[PDB]
Design a binder for this molecule. Structure first.
Ligand SMILES: Nc1cc(=O)[nH]c(=O)n1[C@@H]1O[C@H](COP(=O)(O)O)[C@@H](O)[C@H]1O
Ligand SMILES: Nc1cc(=O)[nH]c(=O)n1[C@@H]1O[C@H](COP(=O)(O)O)[C@@H](O)[C@H]1O
Lengths: 215, 215
């Protein structure tokens, strides 16, 4: 990913989302779009972004249903032009395999979310996260998401998935994570509010990239 | 809920979704709409259904993100006219409280999903489900979802949440659950494919209601 930085575009207005992404485009080449933007503006926003910016799009849909429904969600998401989808591992292996099957059929990718970045992840998810990551390895998952807010957990995840898997990490900036520390273990960092709520998003992105280039 | 039956409308085409819901409307008064329909047809389909059928709409969005994102998802979902939203408990209490806060602000309801109905739920979710339900009780959640496919787990959930909480249950029909057994513990059952894939959905719904009225 360009500069190892993925923009989390969670503004809920098409005009604002387009303006901020355009302003930071020279620093990124992957945008993560989630339900805040899609539920406000529609699935067509994915193809619009892909066309206007020529970026890769990761659909952060935190997919977390039964296998049949997960299949339908993945099929709608890739039909809309997303390059990859983020899927929860907590619902178990059949739910994840449903997503992997559709990604195989459509030439796309699944990212497995293993431990979440927020405080509540400590309640249930963290205790399952090593096993979720091991399940990923055993299903042949090659792309993973783990938390910037806990780099010792990010280290342990990297250890489970090995050096050839690709690992991206949210929770940088607003949630407390550090870019440079997170990039010791992740291949790329995801940044939302620290860029898109900034008075000058391009300067915010540039400042992050500057602290990165040093590593 | 009319006849204790909620239709899970997971067809992905507006025309087919409208036709089946119209055909079964005399038997239900609550429709659960999830991402298969919304990601195909847009969020406007919720208001369309609410207007055309005068039903209550539960948005099955399996919400499973960090608190800030959950807030945004809930706000978009209620702005679109949904009466209630389904939220995962696995991400922990802060994520659930974010949804409860928005439902309080907008005069709407949250359903907490506690154990899922599919086989993979046995891997991680089932081991956490009693505690997720207890967390719900301690947050003041009054509406819950638990699995028709495991009525001994549905009994244990009912025991945790008490008799005054409202409990709805998917996995009836296609996934193997039985209407009458599930209604020993749940207030209402959710049915999707057994109705909407039937040659005659009205006859399928009627046949279910007939086996219900007996209880
Ligand atoms: N999918 C996620 C899983 C996760 O564990 N934490 C996380 O923040 N996210 C998403 O990453 C982004 C973090 O953005 P920010 O905290 O940098 O604003 C938001 O889209 C979150 O929904
Ligand atoms: N949200 C759900 C949680 C769950 O545990 N199981 C379940 O099937 N669902 C949903 O209920 C419906 C079950 O439909 P069917 O199996 O009756 O076709 C589908 O919308 C599933 O996504």
């Amino acid at each position: 990913v360009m500069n190892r930085l993925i923009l989390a575009m969670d503004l809920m207005n098409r005009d604002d989302a387009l303006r901020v992404t355009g302003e930071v485009r020279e620093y990124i080449d992957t945008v993560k779009i989630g339900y805040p933007l899609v539920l406000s503006e529609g699935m067509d926003i994915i193809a619009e972004f892909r066309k206007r910016f020529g970026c890769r799009i990761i659909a952060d849909f935190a997919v977390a249903d039964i296998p049949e429904t997960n299949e339908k969600i993945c099929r709608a998401t890739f039909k809309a032009g997303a390059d990859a989808i983020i899927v929860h591992g907590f619902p178990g292996a059949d739910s994840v395999r449903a997503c992997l099957n559709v990604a195989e059929e459509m030439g796309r990718e699944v990212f497995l979310l293993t431990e979440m970045s927020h405080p509540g992840a400590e309640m249930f998810i963290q205790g399952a996260a090593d096993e979720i990551a091991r399940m990923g390895v055993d299903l042949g998952v090659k792309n993973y998401v783990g938390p910037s807010t806990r780099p010792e957990r990010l280290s342990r995840l990297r250890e489970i998935i090995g050096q050839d898997s690709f690992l991206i990490s949210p929770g940088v900036g607003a949630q407390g994570g550090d870019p440079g520390e997170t990039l010791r273990f992740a291949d790329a960092i995801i940044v939302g509010r620290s860029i898109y709520l900034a008075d000058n998003p391009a300067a915010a992105a540039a400042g992050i990239i500057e602290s990165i280039k040093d590593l």
